[PDB]
Symmetry: C3
Subunit: 150 residues, 3 copies
């Protein structure tokens, strides 16, 4: 009576494990990347920073925020796949020359291209990631690939 | 006894799936879905005439967007705004002019008509579109609108 | 007794998880996937040459579309019709000319060749495309076709 109910529940949970694992692969193809506990997903279109940031937040995530080389490499795969540089979440909008996450926390990882960040024209407060994975500071009003993290 | 061991094992398995799946729900709905209550809207991201749109949703195991409250209507409008394209709703007055019904044939429980609508303009508007401002307008079914299904 | 309350609780949780998962699965497949039996096809929605397409699917944990029955073929055909783009299948006769095999090296168990196919045209066609009518043609692997993976 119990041992039988438990057997049935075991069957249900085993099915769910199999079905969920299949579904994860389907979901991530072709626009997602799983790295550790984080998932990057591209919207597959470009927006200016403010609009990109709102899209991610409204979706219950935030803009791509790579915090290690492995996360950066995973994000880089999407950028390469779409062949479009992407916005990161980080900006020095508050204090010029100091890049912060959306929390106001200072950077725990960076991958700046040589000579960057350079605030070119005195007006680069957002960050793009190139197909080579390197970062450049860029004007926030430019349109870049939208990639959120969950 | 061994029935207890199995339970605590299962509890761990269900907790893992619950956590893992919660993350995937958010990932899935970005950028083309909107959850509202127990309903999920999902856009195909392109336009079709009504008959084609209706068939796409039905074959996918759902139906055309059928907002049944202000909340559902606002959630749908978010997609329409995001895509910048008016969308078809499920409801028509094809059977009885002036009487809009769901695919089931049930009368409307909610509507958000723009002022003066529905007006059966030209004597030939039996479908319904939702605009970027959330308001509804009867429109010819042969026109192409954003395909948004509900599941 | 307490164990019974726990089994009861966990089963309600699992059944709620089952229902939510089933809903999210329908949403996931619309409009770029098709489920048939235990298999799921999903298109990337762009074209690539065969080697590039095959790598995309392998890297994603699946393989190129490999229809093994009329039912599987028909499900795949829906996606091809939807995108209006012929797709590559997984199968090649690269090893032994005229002998098409799955990635494992197994001989075909099902085929749906268009009349006169496979013909190895130019004496150089070792990949397989599926047309919008669901029929197959051998095609040079260097050509670009719709990417559809199976999982
Ligand atoms: O404006 P532009 O000379 O085409 O491009 C700039 C340069 O590549 C510069 O090295 C970089 O630091 C700037 O962020 C870019 O805007
Ligand atoms: O076709 P059109 O004359 O540009 O526009 C019409 C008008 O906007 C009318 O107010 C509305 O009720 C009709 O549904 C539309 O078709
Ligand atoms: Ca500044
Ligand atoms: Ca700056
Ligand atoms: Ca710069
Ligand atoms: Ca009429
Ligand atoms: Ca009418
Ligand atoms: Ca009207
Ligand atoms: Ca050959
Ligand atoms: Ca050949
Ligand atoms: Ca041929």
């Amino acid at each position: 009576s119990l041992r039988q109910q438990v057997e049935a529940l075991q069957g249900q949970v085993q099915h769910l494990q199999a079905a969920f694992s299949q579904y994860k692969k389907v979901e991530l193809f072709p626009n997602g990347q799983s790295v550790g506990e984080k998932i990057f997903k591209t919207a597959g279109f470009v927006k200016p920073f403010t609009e990109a940031q709102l899209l991610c937040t409204q979706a219950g995530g935030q803009l791509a925020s790579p915090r290690s080389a492995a996360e950066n490499a995973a994000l880089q795969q999407l950028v390469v796949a779409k062949n479009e540089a992407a916005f990161l979440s980080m900006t020095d909008s508050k204090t010029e020359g100091k890049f912060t996450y959306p929390t106001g926390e200072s950077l725990v990882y960076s991958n700046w291209a040589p000579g960057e960040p350079n605030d070119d024209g005195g007006s680069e407060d957002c960050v793009e990631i190139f197909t080579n994975g390197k970062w450049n500071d860029r004007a926030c009003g430019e349109k870049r690939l939208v990639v959120c993290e969950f």
